[PDB]
Amino acid sequence: KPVASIRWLAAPSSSLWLEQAINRPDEVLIDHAHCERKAAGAALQLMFRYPSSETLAEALSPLAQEELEHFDQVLALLQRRGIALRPLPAPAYGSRLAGEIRRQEPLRQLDSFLVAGLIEARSHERMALLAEHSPDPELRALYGDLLASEARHFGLYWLLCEQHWPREVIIPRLEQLAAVEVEALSGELARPEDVRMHSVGVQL
Ligand SMILES: [Fe+3]
Numbered sequence: 001k002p003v004a005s006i007r008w009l010a011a012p013s014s015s016l017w018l019e020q021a022i023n024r025p026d027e028v029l030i031d032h033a034h035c036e037r038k039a040a041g042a043a044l045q046l047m048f049r050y051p052s053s054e055t056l057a058e059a060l061s062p063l064a065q066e067e068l069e070h071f072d073q074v075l076a077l078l079q080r081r082g083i084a085l086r087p088l089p090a091p092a093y094g095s096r097l098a099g100e101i102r103r104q105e106p107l108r109q110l111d112s113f114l115v116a117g118l119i120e121a122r123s124h125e126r127m128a129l130l131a132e133h134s135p136d137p138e139l140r141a142l143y144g145d146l147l148a149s150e151a152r153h154f155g156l157y158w159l160l161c162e163q164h165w166p167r168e169v170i171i172p173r174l175e176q177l178a179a180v181e182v183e184a185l186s187g188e189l190a191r192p193e194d195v196r197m198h199s200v201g202v203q204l
Helices: 015-023 025-049 054-080 093-098 107-133 137-148 156-164 167-184
Strands: none
Touching: 015 025, 015 107, 025 054, 025 107, 054 137, 054 156, 093 107, 093 167, 107 137, 107 156, 107 167, 156 167
């Protein structure tokens, strides 16, 4: 948690998430790879939604390129370990958040940037736990290297919000969406193999 950063998340991950992720590292890693790729797809999709925004393109093209470089790095690790890039099912988290995004412009854009930001903040928080806590050195080095290529204070998605919206508006909407994000992570994991980067486990 760097100072002069914005707090995105309304609650930290639970001890038990971390324990579960260490217990089934393969599932978490496969899922992580899909998440990186999904994160690039979101950046691109937002450009396709706002195709004449040069400020958005200047920010989200490099981000997409970086998310694919992270995907390639996770896939290299899976491949170095002999783990198949399996079609492992995604948790309900992303679909649940995206269902909060309003249908009309321009509030749809605000909501989309905030959801994208929430997802990345949660990935970040959990990747940082794994980087510090995992007993597997190669995972600590992957997760450390992926978080290194950063220096995020506000979050790219926050700055995009500020381009088009006052804080007076951003702030109360992020509070609402941050509340749904923690409700999406509430619950208990039904089987160990269901652990994911965005499976349940927060402290309330
Ligand atoms: Fe990434």
